[PDB]
Design a protein around this ligand. Structure first.
Ligand SMILES: Nc1ncnc2c1ncn2[C@@H]1O[C@H](COP(=O)(O)OP(=O)(O)O)[C@@H](O)[C@H]1O
Ligand SMILES: Nc1ncnc2c1ncn2[C@@H]1O[C@H](COP(=O)(O)OP(=O)(O)O)[C@@H](O)[C@H]1O
Ligand SMILES: Nc1ncnc2c1ncn2[C@@H]1O[C@H](COP(=O)(O)OP(=O)(O)O)[C@@H](O)[C@H]1O
Ligand SMILES: [Mg+2]
Ligand SMILES: [Mg+2]
Ligand SMILES: [Mg+2]
Lengths: 38, 538, 317, 538, 527
């Protein structure tokens, strides 16, 4: 654009007009893992 | 539980891109830090050993200078407190013409020391009280430190010795030549009346022959050519017209209404005969040079060539006004021949070629006039702009001396004596004000500190020596630039002096700027605009 | 909000700030109900449009129009909304004083601002710097703009608009048939990079029409050369064209080429002329009225009361 | 190109001032968490957790930063916490103040090596002065030790329950005291576990003469209450598991499958018989226990607990006086654990908890915390770690030093008095590091809401007399008191480590003038660490 | 924008006044949500998960964890309520209300420039005096069935409808008064809680025995057994392969057949031991024999046991081992090595109930079961969940009334009286911590206030009436939710748990104190 797009209100107005586009669970634990805790 | 929400109230009602800073931590210390960054940006340019900076502005234009106000203007300072310190520096440039870098250095130092005092436990109010009372003491003290005075501003050796200091910080290598030039120019101006106008010193920058080829000209130079065949005149009888060099026409609308072949046959001959009559009346008043602020007509130029009149065309109106002041003429809005009073005179008016440039010179022989020009030669436009800034410093110093002829010792002598005396005053003041008074005093040390740092020596050795010698009783002692080691010498006997008014206004403005920056406690910045800039400043 | 009345030597094209389209295109824009909701408008429908060639002839007419573009086609009150009016470039001071007296005294507007139509056209295209070539029905204008303001000293005014353009085409007389020539002007009329290679298979040059002043590309070039040498890059590289006149032939590249020729071989010139939103001036005005710098530029009602025509003229005489 | 595109490099006074400002920022983060009137901070972990604390290391540990100087300061806090377990805010504040007073001297043309030499001299003399003003303590005086611990928890949220926390920490440390083979040891990290069960009231929190784990019996027929339990600890599983080798069997005979399964059952029987030979009441395993093993142990009237953590098992060993075993065939009465006076298994809330809590001479303990919520108990645990680490530091080096900033002022005065004889160029940094120690009293006064200027002036003046090394600040009243009257006495080890860490980090950050950033790790082959040969070494 | 944002730019920070505002606002928000939960005249909230599941609840802890909230203060208060619930079972709504009201009453004075430290000192003083007044007014009572019934009523009437509360009262009190051993802490694990989803919610009953959520998997097994010997075992009766990877090797189909018959000899032997015990203990078909295995039983073992007339259930719950050995009265076994008739329990009835696709097994007519079950019957999953929550509250209530043999009057009576005592105590406090005491008192006063607010009465008028009645008479009085008048809570049977009140005082004071002393909320662990 003509100006650098930054945190300014001009770019925001332009944008509004239309310019300047914007272990989990026992389900996975194995046989060994299941024994591990119990 | 993974986000801190904005607190109810102002934190939530605030707009999107707006910022709010409050308290010593978010506001005061951040402002002091910004001003410190500014002072650091411009510190290395202070003094004769100050180095130049190459600032490129948003338009890709280049400024090579160690003039503080120029650097600040061409920098895009965006922090508001720094903006305020720069506003103070520009007010110094406007009021006095020299001392902007003092304003910056001193304000930055006062703010740094104010931050220190706030950290030890003082309140901004008490810091401000102490700073203001200490500024009052400094103003009470300064008149007593005045050592010399001008005693004559119609001389050229005394005036050169007086302007040397102001034009030394800028353009250190060649300061006798420039001070001679500026003294010549300043004394040609400055009439028997005590009023001296700095706009009457004109500077023409022509390129290609080194600065030692610069010269003074009692008169005017215009990078123009002549409209006609005549190029030289030895007893100029200038006639000045704000109107074009053409037949006057109607302000409403003009139509040549022909109704007979005879009127058609005679109209053009009548026009030229009218032009011939007009220019011949002008020539018969004795005028050999005509200077018009508007355009020139082909027929009028024809007849000016016929009657041997040199025609000059000045597009600008200020150029025309200054030429009128130069030659003693009056700009006539009609093409009527001038009366004996409306005419101007010059010992010579000629077209020359200074370098690549063609110029029209209105040169008086007398060593006076209402306007004087300094023709600056040089191998670079940037170099010549820097020398023009040095000229502006010298001319503004001459004006300050016309206003107030008092002089204080330079090279840090006044600053060291001020620091000493204000410390001695703060040691007597009881209460919480003494801390701020002593810091205001120590702030003056920033000036000889910057001079020493830039000369290339140990600032602590220099400041200790200066304090020791000023204890022995010598108030005119300051640091020596001409020493590879820390050294000191008599600023007066050396001739390094500053203007009482310069120091007065610099201290006043720097203190006011620091105190203003401190009085801020909350800052509510708005989202940056894309607005087409301020309407009034164009 | 802020009412943005875009006169633009067109129609009234009035509305509010923030709207992407005007809401009050009066000139050439219910019944059987009860009240005066057609008669009052029936009066205005046949009233002559005051602005001719971009200049206000009849002020009573214009005032009656505005009044009917406030109470009838907007159903609002000007006593609480700031107004942004538009003026043609190099518009006499007297017209400014007249419209400012109308707004502040008659319509009692709290604050108002008068903007140049070319500046608002540039705004609608999103930029703030550049040289706008505005060629409409009666006038041609080159407006150099830097920092968003029309430099009042480099405005070169030549006259080769729709009328002057269709003239030679007529030459190649009756209203209907010169309007056949103008229908061809309205339709495709592709600009010729070189008239040689364009006539082989069958404004830029005054001699063509019969004038003796300057081309439009010469005009742009000199308007750029009467500005700062640093902003010269921006003027040369942000030339924005506007006006249905200049649109009809779609002249971009012939200009670009001969302007490049005129300019030094440094600045690269790019002309952005594809928008044709048919409300560019209105959208530029809306952008300005939406900004807060518009509140900054407000000629306020108190300011008017305290200064008069001097406040309208912004002092600096 | 030469260096990578992502490689940035800064150098010079910019880097120095940036590092010093980063350090000052880290110090300003936690400056308010110092003293008995500090306020809590609620930090939000990236795991959705919450940390409410006024502990310097907790705060700086939950923060993450990207400036390497800030990283260095967080590492300071970590080092102080690991070494002494207190002073994590004092160290940060002192390092920040020293780096500030060094920024002062680096603004001038003093080289960082000069500042560093002066800092090292000042550290030596700080150490000498601390050891000179310190006092000894009789570690057998329980009241003295409780006051010492109070002087360490008075600053923390558990100050409300102070007798309780002090007795808890003292009992815990005194019990976990352990000597074996001529080597004294405390090891509060591995023993003296803190277990916090949310709910209940904090006043019922206690240190057990034994241990506690979150486990239930393996079989509901086991006893949950035993009044003189003989306890056996195991590292081995009481199940039948596969062998290390490929032990595939080949069956052809009909009796072999049944005989093999009976062989498994008989192996389990043999293990449990090896155990019952020692006649224990409780058996505790780190690994599992088979249901048949449960049957055999129950027939023997033995209560068994399985899948206990190795650390918990080691604590049970230290508490009940047992030796962990891995082969029941190698079980001896010397390995059996007598010393426990009660094993109980009680339902706290809805959870079964195993207590061994009537031990005689337990060299390990469990501090059972009860309170409002998990966060509050985490803060209580951190405070208790502070208290216990202080008690340990005392028992190791029983020298005591006055708090309230009294030690800082005494050392500052001693260094100021030694600086007069210097007469060199390092006296300015030396006297700056001496006056940088006063940020501890200063900060204290600030957290009270009193006048720093007046109070610190009165204190600096008091500490210039002869017998005034013990005068400091009262952080709950904003006044001056004698520490032998107030009771705030820190361990000499804590203050020594604090000052050393502060000075050494000031040194570390002053030696830096250049930063190279962005370069890649160049290490991907499984994180090469040391593997390489050398030059002989024979 | 601050210190932390200069080092970690993506850091969120609330400092001093902002942090206090954040925390107090969140506390006030939670209070505004939960104000309606308090008391029997409160309203039930419906909570729909992201899956669409429905919860009908009046419980403070359930509502907290189910509301959709992401606030750190709300997290703190949710954890405090979760601890309250884990240790006492009730007191969560009141916990949240008192926390919010302490924070509000402290903001009242902190907005007036008072420092939060002084308010927290006043909080600590008031905590001391309030705990004293609580221990003084507590009513030490021999826990008879009537007292326990009133306690459980005071809880269940808050959690469910009045008719269902009058049912759950008898159910819960009988359940605890049955699983209770003289001077021996109550193991609530010994009260199984099984929910059935077929009949009306007022069919919720107490089975003086056990209800297993599974039945026999062999069809020929009886569906009803009258005089039953129960064998509770934890022994695998299905095929177990060798640990050491054995495998079979044979040279002929006949040898394969011999190995097939042999590979089960190990489990056939344990089945035979069971069958021999059965034959030795009931030589006829008069009595029955029920095996309940925590482990599996393969179809071959099921056939072998059915043939002899045994009802075998497999893969029961690890808690059912203890529940069955305490209800029936046998011994749970991990091996049948040396089993005797003394290892068996007796159940005067065992039968099966099919409900749609699932089966249940009832074991009733035990002699003196130290374990029972609450059968939660109801027509909807959410009805069952609601009744589960209510019975949890009621069981905890009766357990706490028994454990702490004291019991405290309800209906905000203790709160009113403690407020009056704190206000009379105020002068004995030195300095401006008197304001913290006042804040504590007006915070304690939120319970009667909210009770009035929910019964549909004017908070101020009712509260002045109640305080007047308590000052003129001294009778510990609270809110009558049908007339808005003062009433003697101890006389009308409105009882609260002393343990619950103490836990409220302690935890609420502590968390409110710690919140008020927060001066910076900070999220800076990013990147
Ligand atoms: N020959 C010299 N020796 C020492 N100091 C000098 C000399 N010439 C100028 N100065 C000092 O330099 C300073 C002004 O330098 P300059 O950079 O122009 O700052 P300012 O813009 O404030 O005038 C003054 O303090 C002046 O005394
Ligand atoms: N009641 C008190 N009055 C004055 N100073 C105190 C008091 N209690 C502790 N101090 C001192 O103030 C500091 C408080 O330390 P603290 O805030 O716990 O952070 P840390 O101990 O981790 O540095 C210590 O130097 C301690 O000696
Ligand atoms: N019938 C009743 N009349 C008056 N007050 C009651 C009655 N039943 C219960 N209350 C009181 O209502 C308060 C809140 O009940 P409940 O919501 O179960 O507690 P919580 O708020 O912990 O969930 C309790 O303090 C209780 O004393
Ligand atoms: Mg100067
Ligand atoms: Mg500590
Ligand atoms: Mg309840």
């Amino acid at each position: 654009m003509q100006d650098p797009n930054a945190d300014t209100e001009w770019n925001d107005i332009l944008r509004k007009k239309g310019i300047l586009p914007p272990v989990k669970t026992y389900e996975d634990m194995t046989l060994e893992e299941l024994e591990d805790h119990e | 539980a993974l986000h801190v929400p904005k607190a109810p109230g102002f934190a939530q009602m605030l707009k999107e891109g707006a910022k709010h800073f409050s308290g010593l931590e978010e506001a005061v210390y951040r402002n002091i830090q910004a001003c410190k960054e500014l002072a650091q940006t411009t510190r290395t340019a202070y003094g004769p050993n100050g180095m130049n900076k190459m600032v490129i502005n948003h338009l890709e234009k280049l400024f090579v200078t160690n003039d503080a106000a120029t650097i600040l203007r061409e920098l895009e300072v965006q922090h508001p407190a720094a903006k305020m310190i720069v506003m103070a520096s520009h007010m110094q440039e406007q009021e006095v013409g020299d001392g902007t870098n003092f304003v910056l250095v001193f304000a930055g130092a006062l703010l740094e020391l104010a931050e220190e005092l706030l950290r030890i436990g003082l309140s901004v109010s008490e810091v401000i009280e102490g700073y203001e009372i200490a500024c009052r003491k400094a103003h009470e003290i300064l008149p007593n430190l005045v050592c010399c005075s001008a005693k004559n501003l119609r001389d050229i050796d005394e005036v050169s010795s007086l302007l040397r200091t102001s034009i030394m910080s800028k353009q250190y290598g060649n300061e006798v030549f420039l001070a001679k030039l500026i003294a010549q120019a300043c004394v040609s101006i400055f009439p028997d009346s005590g009023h001296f106008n700095v706009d009457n010193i004109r500077v023409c920058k022509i390129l290609g022959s080194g600065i030692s080829s610069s010269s003074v000209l009692h008169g005017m130079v215009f990078k123009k050519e002549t409209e006609g065949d005549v190029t030289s005149v030895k007893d100029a009888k200038i006639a000045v017209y704000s109107c074009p060099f053409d037949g006057m026409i109607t302000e409403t609308k003009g139509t040549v209404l022909i109704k007979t072949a005879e009127e058609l046959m005679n109209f053009s001959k009548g026009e030229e005969n009218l032009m011939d009559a007009q220019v011949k009346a002008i020539a018969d008043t004795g005028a050999n040079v005509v200077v018009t602020g508007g355009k020139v007509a082909d027929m009028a130029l024809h007849y000016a060539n016929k009657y041997n009149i040199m025609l000059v065309r000045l597009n600008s109106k200020w150029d025309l006004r200054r030429l009128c002041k130069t030659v003693g003429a009056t700009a006539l809005p009609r093409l009527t021949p001038p009366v004996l009073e409306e005419m101007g005179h010059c010992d010579s008016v000629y077209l020359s070629e200074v370098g690549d440039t063609q110029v029209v010179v209105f040169k008086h022989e007398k060593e006076d006039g209402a306007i004087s020009t300094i023709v600056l030669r040089g191998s670079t436009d940037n170099l010549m702009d820097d020398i023009e800034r040095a000229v502006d410093d010298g001319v503004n110093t001459f004006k300050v001396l016309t206003r107030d002829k008092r002089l204080v010792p330079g090279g840090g002598a006044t600053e060291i004596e001020l620091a000493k005396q204000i410390t001695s005053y703060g040691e007597t003041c009881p209460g919480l004000e003494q801390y701020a008074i002593k810091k205001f005093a120590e702030a003056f040390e920033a000036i000889p500190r910057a001079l020493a740092e830039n000369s290339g020596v140990k600032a602590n050795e220099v400041i200790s020596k200066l304090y020791a010698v000023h204890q022995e009783g010598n108030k005119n002692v300051g640091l020596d630039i001409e020493a590879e080691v820390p050294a000191v010498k008599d600023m007066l006997e050396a001739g390094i002096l500053d203007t009482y008014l310069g120091k007065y206004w610099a201290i006043k403005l720097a203190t006011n700027a620091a105190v203003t920056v401190l009085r801020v406690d909350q800052i509510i910045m708005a989202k940056p605009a894309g607005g087409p800039k301020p309407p009034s400043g164009k | 909000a802020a009412l943005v009345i875009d006169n633009g030597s067109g129609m009234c094209k009035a509305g509010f700030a923030g709207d992407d389209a005007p809401r009050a295109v009066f000139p050439s824009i219910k019944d059987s109900y009860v009240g005066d909701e057609a008669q009052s408008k029936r009066g205005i429908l046949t009233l002559k449009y005051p602005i001719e060639h971009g200049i206000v002839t009849n002020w009573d007419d214009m005032e009656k129009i505005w009044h009917h573009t406030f109470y009838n086609e907007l159903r609002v009150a000007p006593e609480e909304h700031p107004v942004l009016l538009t003026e043609a470039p190099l518009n006499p001071k007297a017209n400014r004083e007249k419209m400012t007296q109308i707004m502040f005294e008659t319509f009692n507007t709290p604050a108002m601002y008068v903007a140049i139509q070319a500046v608002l056209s540039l705004y609608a295209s999103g930029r703030t710097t550049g040289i706008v070539m505005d060629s409409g029905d009666g006038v041609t204008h080159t407006v150099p703009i830097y920092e968003g303001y029309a430099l009042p000293h480099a405005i070169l005014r030549l006259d080769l608009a729709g009328r002057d353009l269709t003239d030679y085409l007529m030459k190649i007389t009756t209203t209907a048939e010169r309007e056949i020539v103008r229908d061809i002007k309205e339709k495709l009329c592709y600009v010729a990079l070189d008239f040689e290679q364009e006539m082989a298979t069958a404004l830029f040059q005054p001699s063509f029409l019969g004038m003796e002043s300057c081309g439009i590309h010469e005009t742009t070039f000199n308007s750029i050369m009467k500005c700062d040498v640093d902003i010269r890059k921006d003027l040369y590289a942000n030339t924005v064209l506007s006006g249905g006149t200049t649109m009809y032939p779609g002249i971009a590249d012939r200009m670009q080429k001969e302007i490049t020729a005129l300019a030094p071989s440094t600045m690269k010139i790019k002309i952005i002329a594809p928008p044709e939103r048919k409300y560019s001036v209105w959208i530029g005005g809306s952008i300005l009225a939406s900004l807060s710098t518009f509140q900054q530029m407000w000629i306020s009602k108190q300011e008017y009361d305290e200064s008069g025509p001097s406040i309208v003229h912004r002092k600096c005489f | 190109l030469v260096l990578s595109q992502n490689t940035k490099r800064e150098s010079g006074r910019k880097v120095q001032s940036g590092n010093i400002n980063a350090a000052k920022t880290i110090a300003d983060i936690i400056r308010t968490c110092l003293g008995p009137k500090s306020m809590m901070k609620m930090l939000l972990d990236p795991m959705g957790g919450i940390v409410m604390t006024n502990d310097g290391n907790a705060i700086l540990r939950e923060i993450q930063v990207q400036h390497p100087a800030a990283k260095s300061m967080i590492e300071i806090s970590r080092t102080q916490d690991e070494e002494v377990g207190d002073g994590t805010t004092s160290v940060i504040i002192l390092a920040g103040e020293m780096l500030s007073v060094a920024e002062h001297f680096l603004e001038q043309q003093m080289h960082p090596t000069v500042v560093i030499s002066a800092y090292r001299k000042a550290l030596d003399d700080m150490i000498s002065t601390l050891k000179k003003i310190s006092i000894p303590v009789d570690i057998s005086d329980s009241d003295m030790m409780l006051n010492i611990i109070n002087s360490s928890i008075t600053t923390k949220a558990i100050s409300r329950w102070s007798s309780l926390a002090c007795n808890i920490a003292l009992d815990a440390v005194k019990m976990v005291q352990f000597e074996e083979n001529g080597r004294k040891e405390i090891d509060i990290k591995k023993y003296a576990r803190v277990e916090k069960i949310p709910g209940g009231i904090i006043e019922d929190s206690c240190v057990l003469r034994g241990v506690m784990i979150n486990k239930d019996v393996t079989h509901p027929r086991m006893r949950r209450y035993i009044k003189n339990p003989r306890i056996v600890l195991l590292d081995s599983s009481l199940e039948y598991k596969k062998g290390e080798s490929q032990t595939d069997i080949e069956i052809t005979r009909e009796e072999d499958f049944t005989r093999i399964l009976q062989m498994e059952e008989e192996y389990i029987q043999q293990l449990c018989e090896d155990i019952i030979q020692l006649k224990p009441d409780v058996v505790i395993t780190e690994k599992g226990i088979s249901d048949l093993a449960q049957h055999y142990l129950m027939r023997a009237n033995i209560t068994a607990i399985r899948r206990v953590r190795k650390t918990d098992n080691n604590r049970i060993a230290r508490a009940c006086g047992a030796r962990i075993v891995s082969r029941p065939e190698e079980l001896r009465e010397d390995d059996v654990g007598t010393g426990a006076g009660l094993l109980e298994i009680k339902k706290i809330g809805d959870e079964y908890f195993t207590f061994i809590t009537d031990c005689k001479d337990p060299k390990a303990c469990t501090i059972l915390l009860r309170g409002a919520s998990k966060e509050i108990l985490s803060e209580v645990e951190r405070n208790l770690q502070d208290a216990m680490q202080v008690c340990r530091n005392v028992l190791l080096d029983p020298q005591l030093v006055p708090g309230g900033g009294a030690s800082e002022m005494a050392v500052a005065h001693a260094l100021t008095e030694k600086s007069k004889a210097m007469t060199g160029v390092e006296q300015w940094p030396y006297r700056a590091v001496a006056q940088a120690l006063e940020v501890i009293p200063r900060t204290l006064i600030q957290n009270c809401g009193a006048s720093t200027i007046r109070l610190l002036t009165s204190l600096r003046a008091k500490h210039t007399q002869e017998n005034c090394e013990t005068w400091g600040v009262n952080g709950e009243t904003g006044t001056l008191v004698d520490m032998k009257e107030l009771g705030i006495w820190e361990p000499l080890a804590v203050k020594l480590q604090t000052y050393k860490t502060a000075v050494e980090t000031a040194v570390l950050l002053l030696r830096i003038d250049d930063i190279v950033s962005g370069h890649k790790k160049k290490g991907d082959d499984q994180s090469r660490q040391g593997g390489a040969p050398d030059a002989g070494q024979e | 924008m601050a210190a932390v944002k200069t080092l970690n730019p993506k850091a969120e920070v609330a400092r001093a006044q902002a942090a206090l505002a954040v925390n107090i606002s969140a506390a006030r928000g939670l209070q505004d949500v939960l104000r309606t939960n308090l008391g029997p005249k409160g309203t039930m909230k419906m909570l729909v998960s992201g899956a669409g599941d429905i919860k009908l609840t009046k419980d403070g802890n359930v509502l907290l964890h189910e509301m959709q909230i992401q606030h750190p203060t709300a997290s703190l208060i949710a954890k405090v309520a979760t601890a309250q619930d884990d240790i006492t079972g009730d007191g969560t709504t009141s916990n949240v209300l008192i926390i919010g009201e302490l924070l509000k009453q402290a903001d009242l004075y902190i907005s007036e420039g008072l420092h939060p430290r002084i308010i927290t000192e006043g909080f600590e003083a008031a905590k001391e005096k309030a705990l004293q007044f609580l221990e003084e007014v507590k009513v030490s009572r021999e826990m008879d069935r009537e007292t326990l019934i009133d306690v459980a009523r005071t809880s269940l009437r808050t959690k469910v409808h009045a008719e269902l509360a009058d049912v759950l009262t008898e159910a819960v009190v009988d359940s605890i008064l049955a699983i209770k051993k003289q001077d021996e802490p109550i193991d609530l694990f010994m009260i199984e809680i099984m929910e059935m989803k077929h009949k009306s919610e007022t069919d919720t009953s107490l089975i003086r025995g056990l209800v297993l959520d599974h039945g026999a998997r062999h069809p020929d097994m009886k569906k009803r057994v009258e005089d039953a010997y129960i064998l509770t075992c934890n022994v695998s009766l299905e095929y177990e392969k060798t640990e050491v990877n054995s495998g079979f090797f044979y040279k002929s189909a006949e040898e394969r057949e011999k190995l097939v018959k042999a590979e089960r000899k190990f489990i056939e032997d344990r089945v035979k031991k069971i069958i021999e015990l059965k034959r030795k203990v009931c030589g006829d078909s008069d009595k029955g024999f029920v095996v309940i295995n925590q482990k599996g039983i393969d179809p071959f073992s099921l056939d072998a046991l059915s043939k002899e007339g045994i009802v075998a259930l497999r893969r029961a719950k690890r808690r059912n081992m203890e529940r069955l050995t305490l209800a029936c009265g046998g011994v749970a076994l991990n091996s049948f090595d040396d089993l005797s008739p003394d290892c068996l329990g007796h159940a005067g009835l065992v039968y099966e109930y099919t409900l749609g696709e699932e089966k249940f097994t009832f074991i009733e007519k035990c002699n003196n079961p130290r374990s029972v079950t609450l059968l939660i019957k109801g027509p909807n999953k959410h009805t069952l969940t609601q009744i589960k929550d209510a019975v949890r509250d009621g069981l905890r209530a009766v357990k706490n009334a028994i454990d702490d043999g004291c019991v405290v009057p309800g209906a905000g009576a203790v709160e009113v009286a403690m407020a009056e005592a704190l206000i009379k105590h105020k002068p004995s406090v030195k300095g401006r911590a008197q304001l913290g005491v006042q804040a504590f008192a007006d915070a304690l006063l939120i319970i009667p206030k909210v009770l009035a607010q929910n019964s549909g009465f004017d908070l101020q008028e009712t509260l002045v009436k109640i305080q007047a009645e308590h000052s003129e008479s001294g009778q510990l009085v609270g809110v009558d939710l049908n007339t808005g008048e003062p009433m003697v809570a101890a006389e009308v049977g409105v009882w609260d748990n002393y343990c619950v009140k103490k836990q409220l005082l302690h935890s609420c004071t502590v968390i409110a104190t710690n919140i008020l002393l927060v001066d910076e909320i900070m999220r800076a662990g990013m990147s």
